[PDB]
């Protein structure tokens, strides 16, 4: 009754009478002196939301596994109050269901977090598609987790084809069979290793051909598992113009 | 109703919960409710917090909301947010504390997803070999990778909030804001994705040739551009030395 921070409400399917808590009045942004009314409640929600609330009450009117819908109000000039209305069915007797009761929750923090994740997910899509160098993300066991657009073009495998496979499918032997051991060896020593030391190695495409490449790796930790983000740089063109330059330089010396 | 209800009156120290409330805590249907059993589902760290929280609500009365995870079904857990308020028997006596149990497994799953994304972003910014810059729809720098700090001579704290034009020489420096707005208004076959060689300028005042790849995205009604800068100083010196050796032989 006091404090809490959550509002409560009550509504009867028959006679459409509504009674909300004092803490719930503040959530709706109106109600300093006006009494509670079903019409007043639907007058605060936006038109599309109002329709959703009506379908929800009808859904719970006939059967209905609970009631929970979220909507935003126009409480302040440049901000909205996100509210998650939850309610439950309580019948009088075996005859009918006469009054739905529930609570009003403030989900402003929950919506800000949801939005933040959406922005991050969208950005990752953009990065994966835009980045010119092949970007590959593996897990502690070498299982590919992300495979950028450039990785597809360079290695010949699509993301759907590469995700879930071991990163060793991108290299020829003997590295292919010994790569798994290379990862487990680094996870035990835990010293300032080749992570951040670009060394040139050779990768293999699905095609079967091979090419010289430089890789940069960055480690991260999440949920008890480490993940490695690789950035591949193809050196085929660099090594050939460097060879033709060092060959056209030896035509006189 | 997928929410639980419960009340722990300070007087008599009893505790009764609803049917959905016991299912959330992972308690047998036959077992009876009690304050002792409730604290037995929480782990020691969480248990201490709830007890100190109850001691604080009694000696204040400003509500009580705590989140914890119980070992519901071995492998994983059930995240529960317990929120409650206190009812007063008389003018100066607080007697009951009533509230609800909420399932926050999905809410906690979103928090963890965001955290992984934020940690991965920091990893990319620190590890990406090419300079990575992210700007808003008005050219204001939002993100500045480690490589961008070394190439342009600005720190991420110094660069963030500045117009991206501080990295360019004239005349691009003055017309860059126009290239952005003329793109947003007439978005069609522009050079966003096609990267021609452009000239960048470090904080020194020194300039270098560069190629840039851009990617656009939308978030909250506003566009954002992610650029990847590739310094062409070495590439140009190399191929310039190719024509300085292929034409000198006449
Ligand atoms: C595509 C061709 C690749 C080849 C041929 C290759 C080969 C190798 C080799 C030879 C080593 C050991 C170096 C040494 O002991 O001197 C190594 C280590 C390692 N590689 Fe790969 N690698 C490739 C791609 C990747 C990618 C894309 C990632 C991660 C996204 C990765 C993750 C690792 C890790 C975590 C280690 C151990 C840590 C370290 O020593 O730096 N590899 N790899
Ligand atoms: C630092 C050196 C940079 C220079 C010298 C430069 C210069 C230019 C030039 C010459 C154009 C095209 C004008 C035309 O089409 O006639 C342009 C357009 C544009 N640039 Fe930049 N730019 C630089 C960096 C960036 C960065 C880092 C970003 C974003 C991350 C960016 C975003 C854009 C956008 C959004 C447009 C308009 C869309 C388009 O026409 O492609 N620029 N800039």
Curated annotation (Swiss-Prot), chain A:
Protein name according to UniProt: Sensor protein FixL
GO terms under biological process: nitrogen fixation; phosphorelay signal transduction system; regulation of DNA-templated transcription
Record's keyword terms, sorted: ATP-binding, Heme, Iron, Kinase, Metal-binding, Nitrogen fixation, Nucleotide-binding, Phosphoprotein, Repeat, Transferase, Two-component regulatory system
EC number(s) recorded for this UniProt protein: 2.7.13.3
Binding site for heme: 179
Domain PAS: 1-64, 120-187
Reaction(s) catalysed (UniProt annotation): ATP + protein L-histidine = ADP + protein N-phospho-L-histidine
Cofactor note: Binds 1 heme group per subunit.
């Amino acid at each position: 009754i006091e404090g809490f921070g959550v509002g409560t409400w009550d509504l009867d399917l028959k006679t459409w009478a509504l009674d909300w808590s004092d803490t719930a009045r503040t959530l709706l942004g109106i109600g300093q002196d006006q009494p509670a009314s079903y019409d007043l409640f639907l007058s605060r929600l936006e038109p599309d939301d109002r329709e959703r609330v009506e379908s929800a009450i009808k859904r719970v009117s006939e059967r209905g596994g609970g009631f929970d819908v979220s909507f935003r109000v126009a409480g302040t000039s440049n901000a909205g109050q996100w509210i998650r209305a939850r309610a439950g069915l309580i019948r009088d007797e075996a005859g009918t269901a006469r009054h739905l009761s529930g609570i009003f929750l403030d989900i402003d923090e929950e919506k800000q977090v949801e939005g933040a994740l959406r922005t991050r997910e969208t950005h990752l899509r953009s990065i994966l598609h835009t980045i010119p160098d092949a970007m590959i993300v593996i897990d502690g066991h070498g299982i590919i987790q992300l495979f950028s657009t450039a990785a597809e073009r360079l290695f010949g495998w699509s993301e759907l084809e590469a995700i879930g496979q071991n990163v060793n499918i991108l290299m020829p032997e003997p590295d292919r069979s010994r790569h798994d051991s290379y990862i487990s060896r680094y996870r035990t020593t835990s010293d300032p290793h080749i992570i951040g030391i670009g060394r040139i190695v050779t990768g293999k495409r699905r095609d079967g051909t091979t090419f010289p490449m430089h890789l940069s790796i960055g480690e991260m930790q999440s949920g008890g598992e480490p993940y490695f983000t690789g950035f591949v740089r193809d050196l085929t063109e660099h090594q050939q113009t460097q060879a033709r330059l060092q060959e056209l330089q030896s035509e006189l010396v």
